[PDB]
Design an enzyme around this catalytic site. Structure first.
Site, PDB file in Angstrom:
ATOM      1  N   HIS A  57       7.373  -6.511  -3.219  1.00  0.00           N
ATOM      2  CA  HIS A  57       6.602  -5.396  -2.638  1.00  0.00           C
ATOM      3  C   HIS A  57       7.456  -4.382  -1.865  1.00  0.00           C
ATOM      4  CE1 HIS A  57       2.517  -3.903  -1.604  1.00  0.00           C
ATOM      5  NE2 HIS A  57       3.140  -3.395  -0.557  1.00  0.00           N
ATOM      6  N   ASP A 106       6.946  -0.120  -0.507  1.00  0.00           N
ATOM      7  CA  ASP A 106       6.053   1.050  -0.381  1.00  0.00           C
ATOM      8  C   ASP A 106       6.777   2.410  -0.401  1.00  0.00           C
ATOM      9  OD1 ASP A 106       4.120  -1.080   1.552  1.00  0.00           O
ATOM     10  OD2 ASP A 106       3.207   0.095  -0.057  1.00  0.00           O
ATOM     11  N   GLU A 130      -2.458  -2.219  -4.124  1.00  0.00           N
ATOM     12  CA  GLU A 130      -2.634  -3.014  -2.915  1.00  0.00           C
ATOM     13  C   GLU A 130      -4.051  -2.884  -2.356  1.00  0.00           C
ATOM     14  OE1 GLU A 130       0.350  -2.283   0.083  1.00  0.00           O
ATOM     15  OE2 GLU A 130       0.027  -4.237   1.017  1.00  0.00           O
ATOM     16  N   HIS A 149      -6.518  -5.041   1.026  1.00  0.00           N
ATOM     17  CA  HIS A 149      -5.520  -4.625   2.014  1.00  0.00           C
ATOM     18  C   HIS A 149      -6.063  -5.076   3.385  1.00  0.00           C
ATOM     19  CE1 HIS A 149      -3.002  -1.663   4.411  1.00  0.00           C
ATOM     20  NE2 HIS A 149      -2.118  -2.422   3.792  1.00  0.00           N
ATOM     21  N   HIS A 172       3.851 -10.348  -0.603  1.00  0.00           N
ATOM     22  CA  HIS A 172       4.540 -10.276   0.686  1.00  0.00           C
ATOM     23  C   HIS A 172       3.767 -11.023   1.784  1.00  0.00           C
ATOM     24  CE1 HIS A 172       1.904  -6.816   0.409  1.00  0.00           C
ATOM     25  NE2 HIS A 172       2.077  -6.498   1.679  1.00  0.00           N
TER      26      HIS A 172
END
Ligand SMILES: [Cl-]
Ligand SMILES: [Cl-]
Ligand SMILES: [Cl-]
Ligand SMILES: [Cl-]
Ligand SMILES: [Cl-]
Ligand SMILES: [Cl-]
Ligand SMILES: [Fe+3]
Ligand SMILES: [Fe+3]
Ligand SMILES: [Fe+3]
Ligand SMILES: [Fe+3]
Lengths: 381, 381
Positions: free
Chosen positions: B20, B22, B131, B158, B221
């Site tokens: 993961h 972002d 996510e 999330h 994660h």
């Protein structure tokens, strides 16, 4: 019959690729996109002009399946626009599922090469088009993702104006052709390799698009204004600009576009329209764009998808040459798709900048300062 | 150093695949997804823990790039949910554009075979995950289209509950684990070949998903509850059920998940967590799931994407065998993706029915009668 033998031979030599069919929306209307255990009905439908048995019977080589959803009618414009995007993904989903559950009949295609490989395997080459820029919810990012999902043409409007262009049937005019955003979107459509479809758009919007486009465009389902005056048909002006554009007008079976009284419309009228366009702008710029399942009833002799051999025979009977009939059947629309992809590869090869959506700022100045301050700390390590 | 030479060798023998990152959301924050003429900044970023130079420097073999968008905060729930879908397509678009504009560094992958081909070509295998199920706007059709766009895992939540499952950080509980729709979606995720991600979900939601899933899942994660008690970390109960599931826990670098005081978190703590999981449920069920760019500051020694060689060396220094380090680096997550795809091919081969969205009726009885009446007329011809 010798002409029927000739027509059958041509249909197996080259693919007849139809420009527009709304069978996916009939599946939404009838089954609500639930085709589990519905093969008996999908082969022999209780409604509509398309099913998998009649599709085989008419010897169709390929099809641009319409992923149409209606124009937004919610009073909240934000909700209706976003709802159209969700419904578009539903229609793209059922199209892909229809193809994947019936691989002996249908095979997905998104290029000239994939059309031919499908046709040589004995499948109907199954392409996808969306019908109106209301379907992308003002998102060029979404439009590029629709291209990744297999959409290979976009009708700029349906029967509603949008941020990019004016529809034909709606008055008064909003933009008076294309908007500033519309003009900029034409560049992006050419860059990504999306075929422009000028059916349903206003006469002025067609004229502006035909001058601006760097790639050849189509009319996925439109007929001829001089033979039948209608807002949806193509004027002699736009036919000439289509010739310059190198595009193709795919003649429509809509009865209102062929005759003043709808019940008088026939197979002969469709042939009149093909010959008019072929005579004046050449047979390399004319196609077939039924709009089957975008209507209740078709013309006499073109009632459903099983009737394509009658059209091919009808064209040969009227003195259109064998090579020109093959062009009208599908080689022309294959050529446009080839050139659209070739133009895209040229512009993408040169590294032309893509059109981006205007987004809101997610971080304030305080968050941006924390990030830059953090980056500097890492540089010191 | 011999251990640093050993670590460098392993990083070139097998791909380190991180669970993961972002970086796509940082591009949305900083550039607003406009990367035209921004290569100098994309290679050397003024913010964040990821850029293309540091990505090369740390010798990362592959990456699941997060297509995260925030949970909907609009008071109108319909608008916010639909807005999340449009934003998801924007994030998928910028991920694909990031990959396509930098083909010497990044190469798109959606399978075990495509991961290896990318790694053997010297590229970072670039996979995609969303996510939270808030991103699909309650549309299983949209979810299947996200799979077609290259999404290969879905985090079930999330930091917000949705129609399908409960998030960890939000109280009180809505469903108490998975909902009825959630349970049914697990079957569909297994059928389509979408990897289930249990990070951010509640402990009860994890337990129910781990028992129900017919394919191995991941925590993209998350870290270990017994070493650091947090709602986001994995309990010993769920670690054992993950072993039965054949899944992989990809250990997180979030400082709050590694220590009681965040500023005390280190590279050593990440290694403690990997060894705990590896000792108790075997090194074939442990991975690396940084969550780089889902935080401002990383642990001491794991400040950015250039720090992966220190982690590989750190594991070897603590007595983890060469084969087990290779497993933790990437072979385990490759195995899960293989098995997810294998299970999907088995279920799709058997012809298992897909989950369909509940749609509104578009036609009334009068329209349906006209269609059936029209079909009968055509049958008489
Ligand atoms: Cl050929
Ligand atoms: Cl692109
Ligand atoms: Cl936005
Ligand atoms: Cl191998
Ligand atoms: Cl599927
Ligand atoms: Cl709906
Ligand atoms: Fe249509
Ligand atoms: Fe139409
Ligand atoms: Fe994230
Ligand atoms: Fe996260």
């Amino acid at each position: 019959s010798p002409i029927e033998e000739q027509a059958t031979r041509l249909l197996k030599e080259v693919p007849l690729i139809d420009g527009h069919n709304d069978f996916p929306y009939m599946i939404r209307g009838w089954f609500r996109n639930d085709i589990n255990g519905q093969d008996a009905h999908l082969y022999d439908m209780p409604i509509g002009q398309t099913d998998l048995q009649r599709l085989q019977k008419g010897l169709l080589g390929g099809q641009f399946w319409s992923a149409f959803v209606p124009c937004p009618k919610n009073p909240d414009k934000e909700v209706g626009s976003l709802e159209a995007l969700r419904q578009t993904l539903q229609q793209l989903d059922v199209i892909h599922r229809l193809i994947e559950r019936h691989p002996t009949i249908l095979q997905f295609a998104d290029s000239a090469a994939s059309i031919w490989s499908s046709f040589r395997a004995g499948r109907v080459a199954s392409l996808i088009g969306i019908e109106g820029l209301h379907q992308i919810a003002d998102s060029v990012s979404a439009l590029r993702m629709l291209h990744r999902l297999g959409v290979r043409y976009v009708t700029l409007t349906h029967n509603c104006h949008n941020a990019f262009a004016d529809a034909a049937t709606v008055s008064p005019e909003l933009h008076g052709g294309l908007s500033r955003k519309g003009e900029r979107l034409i560049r992006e459509l050419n860059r990504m390799g999306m075929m422009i479809d000028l059916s349903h758009t206003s006469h002025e919007a067609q004229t502006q698009a035909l001058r601006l486009s760097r790639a050849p465009v189509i009319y996925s389902h439109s007929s001829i204004y001089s033979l039948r005056a209608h807002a949806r048909n193509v004027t002699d002006e736009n036919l000439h600009l289509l010739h310059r554009n190198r595009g193709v007008v795919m003649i429509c079976f809509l009865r209102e576009l062929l005759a003043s009284e709808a019940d008088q419309a026939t197979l002969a009228h469709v042939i009149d329209h093909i010959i008019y366009a072929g005579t004046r702008i050449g047979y390399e710029h004319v196609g077939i764009g039924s709009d089957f399942d975008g209507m209740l009833r078709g013309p006499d002799g073109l009632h459903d998808v099983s009737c394509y051999p009658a059209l091919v025979a009808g064209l040969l009977e009227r003195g259109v040459s064998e090579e020109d009939v093959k062009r009208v059947m599908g080689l022309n629309v294959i050529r446009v798709l080839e050139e659209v992809e070739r133009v895209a590869a040229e512009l993408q090869g040169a590294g032309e900048e893509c059109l981006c959506d205007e987004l809101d700022e997610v971080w304030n100045e305080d968050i941006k300062e924390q990030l830059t301050r953090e980056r500097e700390r890492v540089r010191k390590l």
